[PDB]
Amino acid sequence: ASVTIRNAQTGRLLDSNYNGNVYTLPANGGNYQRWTGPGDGTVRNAQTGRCLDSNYDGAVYTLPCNGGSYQKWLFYSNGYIQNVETGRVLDSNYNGNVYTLPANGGNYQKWYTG
Numbered sequence: 001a002s003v004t005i006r007n008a009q010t011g012r013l014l015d016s017n018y019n020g021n022v023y024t025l026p027a028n029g030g031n032y033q034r035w036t037g038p039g040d041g042t043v044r045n046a047q048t049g050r051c052l053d054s055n056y057d058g059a060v061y062t063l064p065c066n067g068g069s070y071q072k073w074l075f076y077s078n079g080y081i082q083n084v085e086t087g088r089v090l091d092s093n094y095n096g097n098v099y100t101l102p103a104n105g106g107n108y109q110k111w112y113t114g
């Protein structure tokens, strides 16, 4: 069981690499664009096994999963993906940058997961 996480505004897929960088890219069929969620709050890259992660400065990255709540995420019915620790929401732009920001209701902060 793995899902893609697609930005509602740009259509680009959340994606990450073994270096820990998180970004969005047009869908390319690769496993780096699939994510698993064991049900402990984590969103884990299907290819690298690293956990989606972010800090209070709004940086998003992956790290090996370490049990901290920076690596826990809440999926809302409106498509927000909120960081448990910071309460900021996963966000991205047309150029492929991924970050978190306080929720502003706009579509860049909305994601389709499936």
Ligand SMILES: OC[C@H]1O[C@H](O[C@H]2[C@@H](O)[C@H](O)[C@@H](CO)O[C@@H]2O)[C@@H](O)[C@@H](O)[C@@H]1O
Pocket: 015, 016, 017, 018, 025, 028, 029, 030, 031, 032, 033
């Ligand atoms: O050939 C490597 C890799 O390329 C494509 O994936 C891109 C991106 O989605 C991945 O996050 C990064 C990981 O470093 O690589 C590319 O930039 C896909 O074709 C993928 O299947 C392939 O393994």
Ligand SMILES: OC[C@H]1O[C@H](O[C@H]2[C@@H](O)[C@H](O)[C@@H](CO)O[C@@H]2O)[C@@H](O)[C@@H](O)[C@@H]1O
Pocket: 053, 054, 055, 056, 063, 066, 067, 068, 069, 070, 071
């Ligand atoms: O001790 C700080 C922090 O360490 C670990 O969290 C790491 C990472 O997952 C976090 O995203 C960033 C946020 O700045 O900090 C570390 O690099 C965890 O042990 C965490 O619970 C702890 O607060």
Ligand SMILES: OC[C@H]1O[C@H](O[C@H]2[C@@H](O)[C@H](O)[C@@H](CO)O[C@@H]2O)[C@@H](O)[C@@H](O)[C@@H]1O
Pocket: 091, 092, 093, 094, 101, 104, 105, 106, 107, 108, 109
């Ligand atoms: O007015 C532009 C844009 O501003 C607000 O969104 C911000 C951020 O959430 C987006 O990721 C980036 C993407 O370029 O833009 C802003 O920093 C929202 O109000 C959004 O509805 C609006 O288009």
